[PDB]
Each structure stands twice: as structure tokens, then as C-alpha cells.
Amino acid sequence: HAKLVFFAEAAIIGLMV
Amino acid sequence: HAKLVFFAEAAIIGLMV
Amino acid sequence: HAKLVFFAEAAIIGLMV
Amino acid sequence: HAKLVFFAEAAIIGLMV
Amino acid sequence: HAKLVFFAEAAIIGLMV
Amino acid sequence: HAKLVFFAEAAIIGLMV
Numbered sequence: 001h002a003k004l005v006f007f008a009e010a011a012i013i014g015l016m017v
Numbered sequence: 018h019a020k021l022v023f024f025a026e027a028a029i030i031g032l033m034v
Numbered sequence: 035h036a037k038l039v040f041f042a043e044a045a046i047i048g049l050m051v
Numbered sequence: 052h053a054k055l056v057f058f059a060e061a062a063i064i065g066l067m068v
Numbered sequence: 069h070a071k072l073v074f075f076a077e078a079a080i081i082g083l084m085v
Numbered sequence: 086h087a088k089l090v091f092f093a094e095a096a097i098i099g100l101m102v
């Protein structure tokens with residue numbers, strides 16, 4: 001499983017950890 | 018209120034806590 | 035890539051077309 | 052950068068911190 | 069289910085059609 | 086507002102039309 005964390009600076013980036 | 022947490026393994030699952 | 039499509043009903047379900 | 056946190060009570064609200 | 073539709077302007081707003 | 090459109094491939098990419 002991975003957790004999806006969202007960041008932004010505009011484009012939203014969801015990193016799959 | 019509930020927080021939406023996202024997990025993945027593909028389908029993304031957003032658990033409403 | 036795949037298109038990400040979201041549904042809801044609780045828990046959110048995102049599917050990757 | 053900002054982190055996107057999701058809350059719900061229905062409308063989903065993504066706060067950009 | 070409902071379709072989840074996202075908008076942005078900051079804060080993201082997801083609405084459940 | 087802008088419409089938020091999501092794609093995936095890993096990392097999710099949300100773009101603001």
C-alpha cells in the first residue's frame with residue numbers, strides 16, 4: 001500500500017509513498 | 018468533520034475518517 | 035498516463051482510466 | 052510549496068496550507 | 069455513488085454529483 | 086475558478102484548467 005500525499009506550487013502533485 | 022486520507026495499491030481509495 | 039476518475043459514497047474511489 | 056489537506060462534511064474541501 | 073468533481077481557486081472544492 | 090483535472094502514472098498530477 002501506498003499513501004497519496006498532495007502538494008502544490010498551479011499544478012497539484014500527488015506523491016505515492 | 019472528517020478528514021479524507023488517500024491510499025493506493027491501480028485504484029485510489031479515499032477513506033473518510 | 036491514465037486519466038483519474040473520482041466517485042464517492044463513506045469512501046472516495048479514484049480509478050485510473 | 053503547500054500541502055493540500057482534504058476535509059469533508061457533502062462537499063470535499065481541500066485546504067492549501 | 070456520486071461523481072466527484074473538483075474545482076480550485078487558495079482551496080480545492082470537490083462536489084458530489 | 087479553474088477546473089481541476091487529474092492524471093496518474095508513480096505520481097498523481099492535477100492540473101487547473
Ligand SMILES: [Cl-]
Nearest residue numbers: 002003005017
Ligand atoms: Cl507516511
Ligand SMILES: [Cl-]
Nearest residue numbers: 019020022034
Ligand atoms: Cl486524523
Ligand SMILES: [Cl-]
Nearest residue numbers: 053054056068
Ligand atoms: Cl503541514
